[PDB]
DNA sequence: TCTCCACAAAAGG
DNA sequence: ATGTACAGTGACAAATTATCTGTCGTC
DNA sequence: GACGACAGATAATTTGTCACTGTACACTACGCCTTTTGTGGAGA
DNA sequence: GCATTGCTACGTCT
DNA sequence: ATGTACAGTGACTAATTATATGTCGTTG
DNA sequence: CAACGACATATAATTAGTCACTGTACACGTAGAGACGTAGCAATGC
């Protein structure tokens, strides 16, 4: 409901200079005398300066600068041609079809010879007409999200509810990425780019734990990352750590995308055994807390390394293959040292006064009791349902073995939890009430 | 003459040493005042750390012209009922001339001791710095509306200075709407608008009604440093800026917020960031360089 | 050798006016008057005007404006820190590694800590020091090539010799691209993006022939494109051609890259039979006559098609798989009409006054007589060398064979040529006195 | 007073209609002539289609100041002995710049165009369309040197204009080296130097020494429209341009080329391009639009 | 006619 | 001496409205 | 010294021209991997 | 044995 | 109300030199 | 009554740091597909 004049246009600046003599209160005679005297200041008539003072009275400082012509931003090619150009660009750019202004001009010429119009809009005119559309598309593609501020935080879910994050282990985020560093075996030969599965607290933004390996994102890989993030951290002298990764504990929630490794039955049993509920995210940007740090690892650690592939194939160096020198072990030592000594000790962006580890430790509702390795290993074990034949001898994945207290239930279907790295020994359970109890183990014989 | 005929604006440095709300020792403030010359009544004040320039004079004039409203925190007894626009204005580039032309009065480019005696001398830190900008401003406003404006001048003394001002007005002045004074406010340029109609100012988020459609665009901010809870958003058209809306701060723990307080909060955050040691950072960097140099072949 | 002052400021303009007022010849008594008038109008001392006229006469209008200080572009941090920053940036960006100026500032801080220096250069200073290097690198990667001008033209070979292009059908360039348009089969189902093998005459830049198909680039696909280019082009009414593809004949040179289909012994056979001398290109930029048409095809025809995948992963629309609706036959129709009606009829940009086809036809040394399409097919046949036994018992490709004249000729290695599309019937040749002759179409059993 | 004194510059619309090499008509040329005061000698000339402006008077002044070397194609049996710098340059924002740079005084205040028209221009076929600018300027140089400088003006003594000018020299003026007059030449502001140190100017490729190291940069161009076979490269600093090198045109069918001839060649090529039909392309694009319109999605 | 145990297909990243 | 060209652009002349700017007239 | 009619007069836009230049063409993602969910052969 | 004819894999190029 | 957050930048200030600039004294 | 060097005071032009703001990559992702020549080997008829 107001207009303020800026960039006063030195012509309009001296126009303001003259308009400040007419402002002083005066009688008719000297007002007219200075009107005429100021007419020669800018070499105009007296009706012109009359109109000047009238416009300055009506519009203020914006009446001193000449207004833009009402035809600015419009086109004289006609409404029909303008609509034709805009609609042709809109339809030719529908879907995967990409249509440049030159193609629009060609179609304009085609329609003109169809309609026998001897003056089709020029290609330059087409570019000028379509410039606002391209500009607004560029503005739309460069939209910045404000992000969360302060300590209050919630994560949207596919179920539609908002998962509040309020404690230091309330919600854990886990996601996968392919590291932009080509690694090398013990001899000097390229193996592959490893997979980075990271576990990060949502409330503290501290890295709960990581999984770096050559295996693709699977239920077992997520289980390894969860095991690292849950168990207390112990690193030897090879990692020249100055600080400690004093991080451990169970989560109460698990926030991941819709990957098959995260929607697996194995993850459901893992959550039901460790007392956390797995949740979905509607959009990848909802898991930004776990998803931004990858970039931080690229911009601070991976870009500095002899083998490096960039963000995509457009920026991938041609030197990446022959510059590859780092093993998985060396890369993982560098990564762990970066996380412990830089990333976790770095300041949480929203807070500005706390490190990520300080926020994590301070925000713990209670000091969690460390979970023994055996219980957690049993918890993250792949399981199914199987029965036992006569005389025991339960067979599992084209292998057979028998233990004790097994033949007596021949004909009862029981749970079967195992580690898919040492299949020789498995755990046979039994649902013996509405409760399920550890029957025995099936060991290879 | 008469009331609201000629106004004079002068600057001084308050001898009181001020500190922020967190205790950090700041500099001494600059006090700017506008005086109704015919009545010698205080018109408007601008108490801040900015050196006397065109913007400070504009802010003081904006305070003087507009009707005055103060909260209960000022503990005011009388009400500051002085307003209206002057026919002349005296002060120490071309900004003031533009403001005067826009608001319809002539601006000419050329009472501190009575405040420094009975107010500034009494206050702590005069010439132990314990007063903040808000506290000093509260004391100054209470003194001006309760003592200086309610005082009686040495000459022709028969009524209060406020009463002399009120009786000397030929006609009650029609109030100028606040928006028309936006020319006198502090200005920030090239401020991007984010999704949902938000922009960042002084490390704070400002949600604005009727701003969602300008996301991804650039707007200009006008604000009052005394109260930056609500700022004003403008669109630049290469020759003029047009009002859009008033953007409101979010996440504030207090209903009042000034520019000095936000700057102090940002300063505290910056210092707390600087106390975070980075020896581990440099050590990791140098050993990473050593490790990559080891593999070199 | 010469210095000219331009873009002088308004203050420089008033100084120029005062120097013009000071240039008219006069006498000491009246010269001094305007000298001090210049001093007054410049609100400076007379000796300042003395220095002004001295530098104006000793330097020209360059001395009129104040010279930039010697520290412009210099850095006050010190030569040591200058060299350290530059060396750190250069070393860290050597190879696949990429060190940003922020990491250079971090290393500067670490070194200053090691040197016990309390005043290291700031990160902004590091950015300022490294800005010239970055601008020079960008300018190096943004250098434009003038290209050939006029009618004369030569192509550089990997052998190091320059091969002259003098007339039509003298040098033919053939190359493969992966079309950016997804295709569907009958009833609607995507298959792949077709391969496009283009053969174009170098002297005229006219497209001699094309081969569009899902089969990968191979000696067979190059042979198909070669047959299309050599043979006269006849197209049915389904191709709604307005003009005629009247390009045909056999070239004398074949300028291709180092692709395996082009260095194959099959292509050497084609060259020996038809009369080619196949050549290689040292760099891809040396085969620009055959690469730029790919860009033109993508820009003008392929980008407007429904199922379109831009030549990138970054520019690929998300609707390409769902927008994919065209077939190989319809794509071939559109491509052939684009080449015949638009491309060959377009201006050869090097000359600017004649079409590519008109240049090709006018550049023909002698009008050629076309192959009757049976000798050409025999020419583009895969060759081998087999041994005939037991009066004829050829076993080529694990198939039985027996000719009619192959009984007696059963003790000599016989040249064998065939077309992989049909192994049922083959051709057998002798080798007598450095010659050959056809024996019989050895059939299969 | 003496010979090298007030120089007068006047503008005339030459009434000889001209055509390019290929026959396309061109507007009547302009003439800008510098003339001495002590003598009635033509100091220097500039004939071109460009209207009066700072650049044309600057070029004429540069011609007047410099020594004149003319090829044998001019058939000049008399040499032009003009050189030197005047005390004043009465002519008519920019001219004062060269005035201060060279030393003379420029002023924005008996034109000899009438005798030029009545003795030479009326003879020309296109007098007010078979003469190019080069032939016109050859004939003009012929008239100025052999028939004008050698015109003994009896009203000004028994000596001719050239020898009157020569006798009026207090001393032989040392000629200004040509480089110090690049301010008087025409300018092209931004020009990208390409690989190998080449420039693309007036649809021609220009190559010069010391330019290979400036590939990717932007340089200024100073050129004389009479002869664009050689152009001057200048590199732009904050407030000045420094001479860099001379760039020579490549692929020239003739040893001499003017700006008018390059423009005519570009015009001929553009006309040849525009004369090519476009109906087939428009039919093709319309039919491709129709074909993609009929085809169905995967619904 | 159930239990192991392969396949293939769809659907996410 | 020389990669290849086409979309896109900068600088500018040409065409076209549209406000502007002087005169009369009535205030 | 206020305004409106009213008619040229600038001049501020759009429109079209054309010489110059940036940059993609250089084989390249739909494939890999995983995990659940049928469906069907060997056996009990 | 000893020479053809098939494979498979590996380097290399696009 | 809210995705994340770090590298680079813009605008400003403070420190740091490099000349600009008003006398004094010699020079014709 | 104006040129030519010191000179020492004074701007002021240049750089070095500050610090709030903003753009933009993080979102599984090119080493693989396919072809062709050059070795090794095996089936195999004499």
Q: For residue C147, is it within any domain?
A: no
Residue reference for tokens 């400088």: D149
* Neighboring chain C residues of A314 at a CB cutoff of 8 Å: 312-314
Q: Are residues A175 and A323 in the same domain?
A: yes
Q: Are residues C214 and C263 in the same domain?
A: yes
- Which residues touch D25 (CB under 8 Å, ≥6 apart)? D17, D18, D19, D129
Q: Where are the domains of chain B?
A: 7-179, 185-274
* Numbers of helices and strands, H then E, in chain B: 7, 11
3-state secondary structure of D131: strand
In this structure, are residues D254 and D233 in contact, taking their beta carbons and an 8 Å threshold?
Answer: no
DSSP string, A345-387: TSBPTTTSSSBHHHHHHHT-SS-PPPPPHHHHHHHT-EEEEEE
Q: For residue A4, is it within any domain?
A: no
Q: Which of B22, B2, B26, B4 is nearest to B14 (CA)?
A: B26
- Chain A segment 149-208 residues within 8 A of B by beta carbon are 149-150
Residue from B96, B98, B109, B245 whose CB has the most chain A CBs within 10 Å, to mutate: B98
Nearest nucleotide (C1') to alpha carbon of C284: G26
DSSP state letter for C392: S
Least Cα separation, residue D115 to chain C (angstroms): 33
User: Cβ within 7 Å of strand G: which of A 9-68?
Assistant: 28, 31-32, 35, 47, 50, 53-54, 57, 66, 68
**What angle do the packed helices C10-21 and D95-102 form, to 10 degrees?**
60
Residue reference for tokens 């009727």: B210
Cβ–Cβ gap B240/A6 under 8 Å: yes
Alpha-carbon distance of B177 to B85, in angstroms, equals: 12
Q: Are residues A131 and A158 in the same domain?
A: no
Q: Which chains border C (3 or more CB–CB pairs < 8 Å)?
A: A, B, D
Q: Are residues C320 and C429 in the same domain?
A: no
Would you put residue B4 in left (φ > 0), alpha (ψ -120 to 50) or beta? Answer: left
DSSP string, B53-66: SHHHHHHHHHHHHS
Output the distance from A138 CA to J45 C1' rounded to whole Å.
75
Looking at domain B7-179, which of 3.30.470.20, 1.10.40.30, 3.30.465.10, 3.30.420.10 is its CATH number? Answer: 3.30.420.10
C285 Cβ contacts chain H strand, under 7 Å: no
Alpha-carbon distance of A224 to A230, in angstroms, equals: 10
Q: Which residues of B150-173 are buried (b: 16+ CB within 10 A; e: fewer)?
A: eeeeeeeeeebbbebbbebbeeee
Alpha-carbon distance of A390 to A411, in angstroms, equals: 8
Q: Are residues A294 and A397 in the same domain?
A: no
Strands C171-178 and C253-255, bridge-based pairing: parallel
Cite the beta strand spans of chain B per DSSP E. 7-13, 30-36, 41-48, 88-91, 106-109, 186-192, 198-200, 205-208, 218-224, 227-236, 240-249
Cite the beta strand spans of C214-334 per DSSP E. 253-255, 278-279
Alpha-carbon distance of D261 to D264, in angstroms, equals: 5
In this structure, are residues C122 and C104 in contact, taking their beta carbons and an 8 Å threshold?
Answer: no
Cβ–Cβ gap C96/A312 under 8 Å: no
Q: Are residues C90 and C201 in the same domain?
A: no
Least Cα separation, residue C109 to chain B (angstroms): 7
End-to-end Cα separation, chain A, in angstroms: 89
Q: Are residues C286 and C340 in the same domain?
A: yes
Tell me how far CA of residue D225 lies from CA of B167, C341, D21, D60, D186, in angstroms: 81, 42, 16, 11, 8
Alpha-carbon distance of A80 to A84, in angstroms, equals: 6
Strands A171-178 and A253-255, bridge-based pairing: parallel
CB-CB neighbours of C24 under 10 Å: 11
3-state secondary structure of A143: coil
Q: Are residues C309 and C391 in the same domain?
A: no
Q: Are residues A26 and A108 in the same domain?
A: no
Output the distance from A222 CA to E12 C1' rounded to whole Å.
16
Alpha-carbon distance of A338 to B154, in angstroms, equals: 75
Residue reference for tokens 């090829």: D71
Q: Output the six-digit token pair for A355.
A: 């490190």
Q: For residue A335, is it within any domain?
A: yes
In this structure, are residues C417 and C438 in contact, taking their beta carbons and an 8 Å threshold?
Answer: no
CB-CB neighbours of A116 under 10 Å: 6
Q: Output the six-digit token pair for A249.
A: 């504990």
Last-in-domain residue among A362, A391, A420: A362
Output the distance from B188 CA to I10 C1' rounded to whole Å.
13
Output the distance from C395 CA to J44 C1' rounded to whole Å.
12
Cβ–Cβ gap A99/C304 under 8 Å: yes
Inform me whether the C-beta atom of residue A113 falls under 8 Å from chain D C-beta atoms.
yes
Q: In which domain, by residue range, is A221 found?
A: 154-362
Q: For residue A243, is it within any domain?
A: yes
In this complex, whether B and C touch, counting 3 or more CB pairs under 8 angstroms, is yes
3-state secondary structure of C429: strand
What φ, ψ does residue C22 adopt, rounded to 5°?
-95, 0
Residue reference for tokens 């533009």: B98
β-sheet bridge partners, residue D48? D30
Nearest nucleotide (C1') to alpha carbon of C29: J1
* Neighboring chain A residues of D279 at a CB cutoff of 8 Å: 113
Q: Tell me the technique behind this structure.
A: cryo-EM
In this structure, are residues C162 and C286 in contact, taking their beta carbons and an 8 Å threshold?
Answer: no
DSSP state letter for C396: G
In this structure, are residues A171 and A251 in contact, taking their beta carbons and an 8 Å threshold?
Answer: yes
Q: For residue C376, is it within any domain?
A: no
Q: Are residues C238 and C294 in the same domain?
A: yes
Alpha-carbon distance of A283 to D50, in angstroms, equals: 65
Q: Is D272 exposed, middle or buried (0-12, 13-18, 19+ CB in 10 A)?
A: middle
Alpha-carbon distance of A288 to A257, in angstroms, equals: 11
Tell me how far CA of residue C52 lies from CA of C38, C55, C66, C67, C167, in angstroms: 11, 5, 10, 12, 67
DSSP string, A394-421: -EETTEE---SS-GGGTT-EEEEEE-TT
Output the distance from C299 CA to I27 C1' rounded to whole Å.
78
Nearest nucleotide (C1') to alpha carbon of A416: E4
- Which residues touch D141 (CB under 8 Å, ≥6 apart)? D45, D70, D74, D76
Torsion of CA C321, C327, C331, C333, to 10 degrees: -160
Count up the domains in chain C and report the number.
4
In this structure, are residues A384 and A416 in contact, taking their beta carbons and an 8 Å threshold?
Answer: yes
Least Cα separation, residue A350 to chain B (angstroms): 11
Q: Output the six-digit token pair for A107.
A: 């179609």
- Chain C segment 61-100 residues within 8 A of D by beta carbon are 61-62, 64-65, 68
Alpha-carbon distance of C169 to A399, in angstroms, equals: 71
Tell me how far CA of residue A251 lies from CA of A157, A165, C417, D218, in angstroms: 17, 11, 72, 61
Q: Name the resolution in angstroms.
A: 2.5
Residue from C92, C96, C308 whose CB has the most chain A CBs within 10 Å, to mutate: C96
Least Cα separation, residue A242 to chain B (angstroms): 6
After which residues do gaps appear in chain C, with C to N over 2.5 Å? none
Cβ–Cβ gap C7/D239 under 8 Å: yes
Q: For residue A371, is it within any domain?
A: no
Inform me whether the C-beta atom of residue C144 falls under 8 Å from chain D C-beta atoms.
yes
Least Cα separation, residue D274 to chain A (angstroms): 15
Last-in-domain residue among C297, C332, C362: C362
At the fourth CATH level, the homologous superfamily of domain D8-176 is: Ribonuclease H-like superfamily/Ribonuclease H (3.30.420.10)
Measure CA to C1' and name the residue nearest I19: C69
DSSP state letter for D71: -
Q: Are residues A430 and A346 in the same domain?
A: no
Size of interface A-B (CB pairs under 8 A): 135
CATH for C192: 3.30.420.10
* Neighboring chain C residues of B279 at a CB cutoff of 8 Å: 113
Cite the beta strand spans of C270-314 per DSSP E. 278-279
Residue reference for tokens 């291709």: C256
Q: Are residues A169 and A308 in the same domain?
A: yes
Alpha-carbon distance of A320 to C96, in angstroms, equals: 5
Least Cα separation, residue D154 to chain C (angstroms): 32
- Which residues touch D193 (CB under 8 Å, ≥6 apart)? D199, D211, D214, D215, D216, D217, D218, D219
* Neighboring chain B residues of C113 at a CB cutoff of 8 Å: 279, 282
Of C17, C60, C306, the CB nearest to D101: C60
In this complex, whether B and D touch, counting 3 or more CB pairs under 8 angstroms, is no
User: Cβ within 7 Å of strand G: which of D 170-209?
Assistant: 190-192, 194, 199-203
User: Cβ within 7 Å of strand E: which of A 87-106?
Assistant: none
Output the distance from C197 CA to J37 C1' rounded to whole Å.
22
In this structure, are residues B31 and B45 in contact, taking their beta carbons and an 8 Å threshold?
Answer: yes
Least Cα separation, residue B294 to chain C (angstroms): 14
Of C96, C303, C323, the CB nearest to A319: C96
- Which residues touch C439 (CB under 8 Å, ≥6 apart)? C403, C405, C406, C409, C414, C428, C429, C430
Cβ–Cβ gap C110/B282 under 8 Å: yes
Output the distance from D97 CA to F8 C1' rounded to whole Å.
37
Cβ–Cβ gap A98/C312 under 8 Å: no
Cβ–Cβ gap A143/B195 under 8 Å: yes
Q: For residue A309, is it within any domain?
A: yes
* Neighboring chain A residues of C308 at a CB cutoff of 8 Å: 96-98
Nearest nucleotide (C1') to alpha carbon of A71: G13
Q: How many CA atoms lie within 13 A of C160 on its CB side?
A: 0
């Amino acid at each position: 409901k107001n207009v303020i004049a800026t960039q006063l246009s030195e012509e309009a600046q001296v126009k303001l200079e003259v308009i400040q003599s007419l402002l002083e209160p005066c009688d008719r005679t000297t007002y007219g005398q200075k009107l005429r005297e100021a007419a020669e200041k800018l070499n105009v008539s007296l009706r012109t300066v009359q109109r000047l003072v009238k416009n300055w009275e009506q519009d203020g400082l914006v009446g001193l600068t000449q207004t833009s012509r009402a035809d600015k931003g419009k086109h004289r090619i006609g409404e029909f041609w303008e609509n034709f150009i805009t609609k042709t660009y809109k339809e030719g750019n529908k879907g995967s079809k990409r249509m440049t202004p030159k193609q629009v001009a060609l179609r304009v010429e085609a329609k003109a010879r169809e309609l026998k119009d001897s003056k089709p809009p020029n290609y330059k005119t087409v570019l000028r007409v379509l410039a606002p559309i391209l500009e607004k598309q560029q503005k739309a593609k460069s939209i910045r999200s404000p992000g969360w501020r302060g300590t209050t935080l919630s994560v949207k879910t596919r179920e539609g509810k908002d998962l509040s994050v309020d404690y230091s282990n309330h919600v854990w985020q886990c996601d996968h990425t392919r590291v932009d560093v080509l690694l090398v075996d013990q001899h000097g030969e390229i193996l592959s780019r490893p997979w980075l599965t990271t576990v990060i607290d949502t409330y503290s933004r501290c890295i709960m734990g990581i999984n770096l390996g050559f295996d693709a994102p699977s239920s077992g890989v997520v289980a390894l990352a969860l095991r690292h993030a849950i168990l207390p951290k112990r690193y030897g002298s090879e990692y020249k750590l100055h600080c400690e990764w004093g991080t451990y504990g169970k989560p109460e929630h698990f926030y991941t995308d819709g990957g098959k490794d995260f929607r697996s039955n194995h993850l459901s049993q893992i959550g039901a055994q460790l007392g956390f509920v797995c949740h979905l995210r509607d959009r990848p940007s909802e898991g930004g807390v776990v998803e931004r740090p990858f970039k931080t690892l690229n911009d601070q650690l991976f870009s500095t390394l002899p083998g490096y592939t960039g963000s995509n194939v457009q920026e991938r160096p041609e030197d990446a293959e022959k510059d590859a020198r780092l093993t998985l072990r060396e890369l993982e030592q560098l990564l762990v040292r970066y996380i412990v000594d830089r990333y976790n000790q770095s300041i949480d962006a929203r807070m500005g006064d706390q490190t990520r580890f300080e926020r994590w430790e301070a925000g713990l509702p209670t000091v969690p009791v460390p979970i023994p390795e055996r219980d957690l290993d049993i918890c993250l074990m792949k399981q199914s349902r199987r029965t036992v034949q006569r005389g025991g001898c339960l067979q599992f994945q084209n292998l057979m073995y028998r233990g004790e207290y097994l033949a007596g239930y021949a004909g009862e279907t029981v749970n079967l939890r195992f580690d898919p790295r040492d299949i020789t020994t498995i755990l046979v359970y039994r649902q013996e009430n509405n409760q399920e109890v550890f029957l025995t183990r099936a060991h290879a014989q | 003459d008469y009331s609201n005929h000629v106004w004079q604006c002068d600057h001084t440095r308050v001898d009181v040493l001020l500190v922020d709300q967190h205790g950090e020792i700041l500099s001494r403030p600059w006090l700017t005042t506008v005086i109704d010359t015919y009545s010698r009544c205080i018109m408007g004040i601008n108490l801040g750390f900015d050196a006397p320039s065109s913007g400070v004079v504009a802010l003081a004039l904006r305070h003087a012209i507009l009707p005055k409203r103060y909260g209960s925190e000022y503990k005011l007894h009388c009400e500051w009922g002085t307003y209206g626009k002057p026919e002349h204005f005296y002060t120490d580039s071309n900004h003031l001339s533009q403001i005067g032309a826009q608001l319809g009065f002539v601006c000419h480019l050329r009472p501190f001791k009575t405040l420094n005696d009975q107010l500034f001398s009494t206050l702590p830190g005069y010439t132990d710095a314990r007063l903040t900008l808000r506290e000093l401003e509260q004391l100054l406003v209470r003194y001006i509306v309760d003592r200086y404006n309610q005082s009686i001048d040495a000459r022709m003394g028969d009524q209060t200075r406020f009463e002399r001002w009120e009786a000397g007005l030929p006609t009650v002045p029609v109030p100028i709407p606040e928006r028309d004074l936006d020319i006198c406010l502090m200005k920030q340029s090239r401020r991007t608008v984010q999704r949902g109609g938000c922009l960042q100012f002084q490390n704070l988020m400002y949600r604005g009604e009727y701003l969602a459609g300008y996301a991804g665009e650039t707007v200009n901010l006008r604000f009052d440093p005394r109260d930056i809870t609500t700022i004003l958003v403008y669109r630049q058209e290469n020759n003029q800026e047009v009002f859009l809306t008033r953007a409101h701060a979010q996440g504030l723990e207090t209903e009042q917020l000034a520019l000095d307080e936000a700057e102090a909060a940002s300063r505290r955050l910056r210092t707390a960031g600087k106390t975070i040691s980075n020896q581990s950072l440099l050590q990791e960097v140098v050993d990473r360089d050593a490790l990559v140099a080891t593999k070199k072949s």
